[PDB]
Short mmCIF file of C-alpha atoms in Angstrom, two decimals:
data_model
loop_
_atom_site.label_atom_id
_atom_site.label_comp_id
_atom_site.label_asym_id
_atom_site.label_seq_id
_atom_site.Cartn_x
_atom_site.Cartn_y
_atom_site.Cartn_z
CA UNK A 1 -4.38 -20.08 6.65
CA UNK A 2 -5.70 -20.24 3.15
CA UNK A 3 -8.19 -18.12 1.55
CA UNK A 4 -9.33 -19.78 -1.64
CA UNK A 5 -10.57 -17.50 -4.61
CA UNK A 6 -8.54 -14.60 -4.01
CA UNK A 7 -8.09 -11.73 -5.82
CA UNK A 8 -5.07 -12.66 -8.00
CA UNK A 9 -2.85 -10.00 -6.27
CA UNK A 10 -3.38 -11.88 -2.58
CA UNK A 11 -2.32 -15.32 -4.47
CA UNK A 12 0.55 -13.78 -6.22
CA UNK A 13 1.77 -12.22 -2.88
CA UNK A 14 2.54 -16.11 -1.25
CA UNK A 15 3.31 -17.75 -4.09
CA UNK A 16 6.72 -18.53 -6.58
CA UNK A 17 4.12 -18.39 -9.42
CA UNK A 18 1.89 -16.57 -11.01
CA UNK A 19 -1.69 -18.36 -12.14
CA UNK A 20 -2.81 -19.37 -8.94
CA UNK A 21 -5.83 -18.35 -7.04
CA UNK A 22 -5.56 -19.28 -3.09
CA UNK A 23 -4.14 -16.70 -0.89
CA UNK A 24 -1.44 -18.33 1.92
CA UNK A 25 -0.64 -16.07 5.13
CA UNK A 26 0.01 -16.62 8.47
CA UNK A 27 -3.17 -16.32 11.01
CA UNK A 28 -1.87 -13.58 13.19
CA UNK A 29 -2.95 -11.65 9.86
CA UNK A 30 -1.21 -8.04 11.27
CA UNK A 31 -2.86 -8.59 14.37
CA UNK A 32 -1.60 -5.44 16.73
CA UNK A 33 0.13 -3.87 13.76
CA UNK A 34 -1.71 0.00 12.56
CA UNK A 35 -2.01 0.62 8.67
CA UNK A 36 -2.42 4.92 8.15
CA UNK A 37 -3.75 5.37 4.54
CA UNK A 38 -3.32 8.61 3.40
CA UNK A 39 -5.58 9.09 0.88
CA UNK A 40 -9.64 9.84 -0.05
CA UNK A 41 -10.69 8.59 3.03
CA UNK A 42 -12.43 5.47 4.08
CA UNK A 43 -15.41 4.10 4.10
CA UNK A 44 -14.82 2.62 7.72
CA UNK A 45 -18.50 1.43 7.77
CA UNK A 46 -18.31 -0.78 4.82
CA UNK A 47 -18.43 -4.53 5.90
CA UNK A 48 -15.25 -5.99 4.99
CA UNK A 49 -13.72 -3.51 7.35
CA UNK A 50 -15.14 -5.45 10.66
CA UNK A 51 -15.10 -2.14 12.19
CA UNK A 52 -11.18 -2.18 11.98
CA UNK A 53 -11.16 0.61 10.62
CA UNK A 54 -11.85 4.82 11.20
CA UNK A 55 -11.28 8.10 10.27
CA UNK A 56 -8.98 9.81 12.58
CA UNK A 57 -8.10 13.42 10.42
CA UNK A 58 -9.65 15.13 8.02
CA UNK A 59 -8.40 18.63 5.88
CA UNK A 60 -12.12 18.96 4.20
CA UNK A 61 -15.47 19.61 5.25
CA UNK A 62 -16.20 15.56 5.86
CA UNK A 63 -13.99 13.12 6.58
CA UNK A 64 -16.12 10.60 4.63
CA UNK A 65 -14.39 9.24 1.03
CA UNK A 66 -16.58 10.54 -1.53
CA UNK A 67 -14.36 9.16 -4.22
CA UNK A 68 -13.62 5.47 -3.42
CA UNK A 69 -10.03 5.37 -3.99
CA UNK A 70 -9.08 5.96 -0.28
CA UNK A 71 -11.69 2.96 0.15
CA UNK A 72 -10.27 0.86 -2.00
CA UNK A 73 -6.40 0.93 -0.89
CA UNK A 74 -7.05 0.52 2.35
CA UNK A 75 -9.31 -2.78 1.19
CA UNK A 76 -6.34 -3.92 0.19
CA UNK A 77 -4.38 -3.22 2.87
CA UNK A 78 -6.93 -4.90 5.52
CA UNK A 79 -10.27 -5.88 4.16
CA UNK A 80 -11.69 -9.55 4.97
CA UNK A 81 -11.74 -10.29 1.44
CA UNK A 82 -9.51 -7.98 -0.45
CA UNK A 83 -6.84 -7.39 2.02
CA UNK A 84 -2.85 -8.31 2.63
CA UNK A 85 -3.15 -8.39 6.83
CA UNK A 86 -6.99 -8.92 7.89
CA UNK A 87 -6.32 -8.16 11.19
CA UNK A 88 -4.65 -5.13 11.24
CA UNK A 89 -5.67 -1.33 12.37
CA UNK A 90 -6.64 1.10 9.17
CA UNK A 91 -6.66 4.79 10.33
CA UNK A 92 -7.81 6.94 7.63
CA UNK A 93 -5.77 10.66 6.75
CA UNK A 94 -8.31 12.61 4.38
CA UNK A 95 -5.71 14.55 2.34
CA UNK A 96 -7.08 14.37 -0.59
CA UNK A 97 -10.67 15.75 -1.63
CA UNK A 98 -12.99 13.99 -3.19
CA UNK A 99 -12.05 14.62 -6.99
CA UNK A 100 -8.63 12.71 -5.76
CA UNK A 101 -6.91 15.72 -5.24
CA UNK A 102 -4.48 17.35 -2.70
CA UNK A 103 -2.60 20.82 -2.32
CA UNK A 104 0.79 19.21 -1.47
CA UNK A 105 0.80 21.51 1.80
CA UNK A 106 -2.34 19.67 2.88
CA UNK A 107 -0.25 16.32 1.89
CA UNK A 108 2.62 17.50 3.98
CA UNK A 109 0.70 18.48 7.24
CA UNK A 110 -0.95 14.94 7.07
CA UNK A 111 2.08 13.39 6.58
CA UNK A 112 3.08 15.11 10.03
CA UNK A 113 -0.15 14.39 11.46
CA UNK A 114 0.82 10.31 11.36
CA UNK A 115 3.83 11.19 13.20
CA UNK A 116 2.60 12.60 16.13
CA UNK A 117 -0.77 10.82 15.99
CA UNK A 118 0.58 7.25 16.14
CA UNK A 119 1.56 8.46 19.80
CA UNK A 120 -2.11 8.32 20.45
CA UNK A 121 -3.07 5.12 19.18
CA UNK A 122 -2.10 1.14 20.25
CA UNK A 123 -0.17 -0.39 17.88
CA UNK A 124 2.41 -3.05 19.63
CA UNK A 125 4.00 -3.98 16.68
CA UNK A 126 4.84 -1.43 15.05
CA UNK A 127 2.90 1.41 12.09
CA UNK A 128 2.97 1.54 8.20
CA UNK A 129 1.76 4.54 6.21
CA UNK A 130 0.48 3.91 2.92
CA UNK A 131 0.64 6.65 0.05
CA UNK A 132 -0.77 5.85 -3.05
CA UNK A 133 -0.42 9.21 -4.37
CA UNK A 134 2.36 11.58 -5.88
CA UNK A 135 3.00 14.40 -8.21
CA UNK A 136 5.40 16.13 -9.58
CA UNK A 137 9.36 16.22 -8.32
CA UNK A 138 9.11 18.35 -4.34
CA UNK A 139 11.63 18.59 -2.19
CA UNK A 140 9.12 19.48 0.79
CA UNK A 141 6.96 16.44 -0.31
CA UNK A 142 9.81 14.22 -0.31
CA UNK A 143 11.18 15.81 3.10
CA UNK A 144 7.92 15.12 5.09
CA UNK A 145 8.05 10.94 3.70
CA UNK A 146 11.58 11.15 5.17
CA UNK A 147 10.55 12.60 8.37
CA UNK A 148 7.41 10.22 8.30
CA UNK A 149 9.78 7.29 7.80
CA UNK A 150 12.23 8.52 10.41
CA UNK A 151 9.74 8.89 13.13
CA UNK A 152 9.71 4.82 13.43
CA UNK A 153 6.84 4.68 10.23
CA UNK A 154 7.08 1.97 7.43
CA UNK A 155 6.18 4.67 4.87
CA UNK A 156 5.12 3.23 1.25
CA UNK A 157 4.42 5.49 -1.70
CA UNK A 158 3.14 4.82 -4.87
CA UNK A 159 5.76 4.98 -7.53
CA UNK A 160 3.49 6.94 -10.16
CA UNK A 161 1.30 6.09 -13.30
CA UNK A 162 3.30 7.77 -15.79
CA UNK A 163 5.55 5.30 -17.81
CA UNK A 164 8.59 6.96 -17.08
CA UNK A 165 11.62 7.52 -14.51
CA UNK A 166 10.10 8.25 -10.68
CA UNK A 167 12.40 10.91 -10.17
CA UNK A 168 10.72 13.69 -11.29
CA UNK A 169 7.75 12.63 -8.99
CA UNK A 170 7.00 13.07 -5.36
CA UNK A 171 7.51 11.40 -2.89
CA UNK A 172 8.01 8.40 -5.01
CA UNK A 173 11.57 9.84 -5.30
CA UNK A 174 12.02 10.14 -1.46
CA UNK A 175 15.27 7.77 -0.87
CA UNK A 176 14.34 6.65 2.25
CA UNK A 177 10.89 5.24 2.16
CA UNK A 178 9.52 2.81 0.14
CA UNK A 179 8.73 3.32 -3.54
CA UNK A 180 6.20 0.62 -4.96
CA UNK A 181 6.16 -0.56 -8.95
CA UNK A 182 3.05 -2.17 -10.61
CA UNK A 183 2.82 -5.61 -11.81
CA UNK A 184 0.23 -7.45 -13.67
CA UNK A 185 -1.17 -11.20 -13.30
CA UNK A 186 1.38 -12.45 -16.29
CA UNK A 187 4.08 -10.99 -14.41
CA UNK A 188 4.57 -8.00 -16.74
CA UNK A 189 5.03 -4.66 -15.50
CA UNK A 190 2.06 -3.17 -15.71
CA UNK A 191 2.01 -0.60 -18.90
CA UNK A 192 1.77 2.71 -17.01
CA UNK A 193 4.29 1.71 -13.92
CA UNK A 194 6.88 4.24 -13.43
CA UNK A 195 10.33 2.36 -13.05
CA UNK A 196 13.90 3.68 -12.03
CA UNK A 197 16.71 3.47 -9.51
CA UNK A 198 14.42 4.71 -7.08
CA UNK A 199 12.03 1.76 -6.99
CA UNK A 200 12.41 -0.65 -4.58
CA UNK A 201 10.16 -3.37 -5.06
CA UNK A 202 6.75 -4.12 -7.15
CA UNK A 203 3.32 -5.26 -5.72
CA UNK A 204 0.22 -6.59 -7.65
CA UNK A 205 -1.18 -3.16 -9.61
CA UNK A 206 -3.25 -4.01 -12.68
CA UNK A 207 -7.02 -4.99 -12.03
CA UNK A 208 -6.93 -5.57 -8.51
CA UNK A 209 -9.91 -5.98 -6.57
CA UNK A 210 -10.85 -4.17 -3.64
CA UNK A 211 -13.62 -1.96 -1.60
CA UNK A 212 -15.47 0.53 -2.92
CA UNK A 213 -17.78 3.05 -1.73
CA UNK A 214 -21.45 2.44 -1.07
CA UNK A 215 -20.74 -0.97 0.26
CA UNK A 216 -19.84 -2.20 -2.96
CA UNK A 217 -16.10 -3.61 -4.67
CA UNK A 218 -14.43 -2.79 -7.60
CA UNK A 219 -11.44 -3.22 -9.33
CA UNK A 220 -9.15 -0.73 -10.85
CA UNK A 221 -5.05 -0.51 -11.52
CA UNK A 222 -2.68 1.53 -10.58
CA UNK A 223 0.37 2.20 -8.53
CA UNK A 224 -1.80 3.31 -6.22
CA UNK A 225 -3.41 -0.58 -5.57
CA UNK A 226 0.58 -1.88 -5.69
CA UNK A 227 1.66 -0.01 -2.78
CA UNK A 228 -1.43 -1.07 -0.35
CA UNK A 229 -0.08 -4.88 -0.86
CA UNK A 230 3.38 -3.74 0.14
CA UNK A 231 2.10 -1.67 3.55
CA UNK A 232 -0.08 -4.42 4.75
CA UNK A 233 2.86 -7.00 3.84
CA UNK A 234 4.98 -4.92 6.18
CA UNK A 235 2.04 -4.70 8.66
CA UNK A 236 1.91 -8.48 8.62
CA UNK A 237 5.65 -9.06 8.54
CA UNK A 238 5.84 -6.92 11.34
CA UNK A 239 3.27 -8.67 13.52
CA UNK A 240 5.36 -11.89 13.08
CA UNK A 241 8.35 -10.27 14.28
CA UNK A 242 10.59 -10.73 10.81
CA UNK A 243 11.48 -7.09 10.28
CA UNK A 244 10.53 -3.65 11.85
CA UNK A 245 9.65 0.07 10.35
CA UNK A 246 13.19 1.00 9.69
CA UNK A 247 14.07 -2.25 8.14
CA UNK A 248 11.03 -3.57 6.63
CA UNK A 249 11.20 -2.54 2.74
CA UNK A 250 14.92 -3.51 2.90
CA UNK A 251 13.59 -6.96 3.80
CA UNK A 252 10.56 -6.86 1.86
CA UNK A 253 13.30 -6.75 -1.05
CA UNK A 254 15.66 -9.27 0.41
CA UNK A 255 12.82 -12.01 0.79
CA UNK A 256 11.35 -10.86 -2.94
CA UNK A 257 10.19 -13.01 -5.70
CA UNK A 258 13.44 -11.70 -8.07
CA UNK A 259 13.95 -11.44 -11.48
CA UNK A 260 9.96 -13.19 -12.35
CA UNK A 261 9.14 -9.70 -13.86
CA UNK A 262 9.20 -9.04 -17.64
CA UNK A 263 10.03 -5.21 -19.33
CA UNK A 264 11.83 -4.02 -16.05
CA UNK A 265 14.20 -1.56 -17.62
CA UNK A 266 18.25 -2.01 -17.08
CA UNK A 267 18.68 -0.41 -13.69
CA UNK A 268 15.46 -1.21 -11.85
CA UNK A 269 14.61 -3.51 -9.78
CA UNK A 270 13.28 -6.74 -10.78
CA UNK A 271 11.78 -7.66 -7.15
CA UNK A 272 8.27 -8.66 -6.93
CA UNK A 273 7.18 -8.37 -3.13
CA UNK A 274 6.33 -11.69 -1.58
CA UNK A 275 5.10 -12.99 1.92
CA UNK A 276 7.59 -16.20 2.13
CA UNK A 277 4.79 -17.70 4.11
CA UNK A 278 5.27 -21.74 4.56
CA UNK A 279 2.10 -23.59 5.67
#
């Protein structure tokens, strides 16, 4: 299937170049697959969602996203328009309030929540978690990704906005899940992407497209908007059968666009993640 005018992060996804505007995917589009974003919330009523979308937890008084950034990951994760696998399922995880912020106990008990909860829903092949937020260094933090991951969960996290090593930042540091870089439509890394060994693979980040609340779209970068590409990727690679939870950022790196990206420091990865999708 082709989807012409795409956001630029959609093209870059199927292509072996940047500069192009068509988005290429196969049409089972994450059909069957579940997408958890853990996050603001979501607007589930907003078009583009096709009523694929709800809230199934919420820590605060409303599980509505009063923010937009919930809204706009999981656009890119799943919208019509703006999203990596139109088909899949996009269960919202209200963790975060809506000034964007989260006690990282709250964090942690929705990070268990997915576990058990993907019990209760339909999802024949197979669940991704999506993560697009962090802060400092946490063993407990990092813990609960592992668990999340270990349960049979693709788990993605955002790899943090500060310019530096993603060590000292949780659960982008978690070993075992998958830690997503920002890239920009030149191919650069995008100027506030962490980097480091712990990175395992870069997604589309800087002015990317998506949902927003009130019915409306905006675009804004950030980790954050990298690591929605990568879970519905997974979602949709998942659907076609190419990889599973435990395996899929492993492949998402083996199938990679490599060594495109420009100012990757020495020792991280230069892996830009990419759909290998052959019309």
């Amino acid at each position: 299937a082709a989807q012409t005018n795409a956001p630029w992060g959609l093209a870059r996804i199927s292509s072996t170049s940047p500069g192009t505007s068509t988005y290429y995917y196969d049409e089972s589009a994450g059909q069957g697959s579940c997408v958890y974003v853990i996050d603001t919330g979501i607007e589930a009523s907003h078009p583009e969602f096709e009523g694929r979308a709800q809230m199934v937890k919420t820590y605060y008084y409303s599980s509505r996203d009063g923010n937009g950034h919930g809204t706009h990951c999981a656009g890119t994760v799943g919208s019509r328009t703006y999203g990596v696998a139109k088909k899949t399922q996009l269960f919202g995880v209200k963790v975060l309030d809506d000034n964007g912020s989260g006690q990282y106990s709250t964090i942690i008990a929705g990070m268990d929540f997915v576990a058990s909860d993907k019990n209760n829903r339909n999802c024949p092949k197979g669940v991704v978690a999506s993560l697009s937020l962090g802060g400092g260094y946490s063993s407990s933090v990092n813990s609960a990704a592992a668990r999340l991951q270990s349960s049979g969960v693709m788990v993605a996290v955002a790899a943090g906005n500060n310019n530096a090593d993603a060590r000292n930042y949780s659960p982008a540091s978690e070993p075992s899940v998958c830690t997503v870089g920002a890239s920009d439509r030149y191919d650069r890394r995008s100027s506030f992407s962490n980097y480091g060994s712990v990175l395992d693979i870069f997604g589309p980040g800087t002015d990317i497209l998506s949902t927003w609340i009130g019915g409306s779209t905006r675009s804004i970068s950030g980790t954050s908007m990298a690591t929605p590409h990568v879970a519905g990727l997974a979602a949709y690679l998942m659907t076609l059968g190419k990889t599973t939870a435990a395996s899929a950022c492993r492949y998402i790196a083996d199938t990679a666009n490599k060594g495109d990206l420009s100012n990757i420091p020495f020792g991280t990865v230069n892996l830009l993640a990419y759909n290998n999708y052959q019309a």
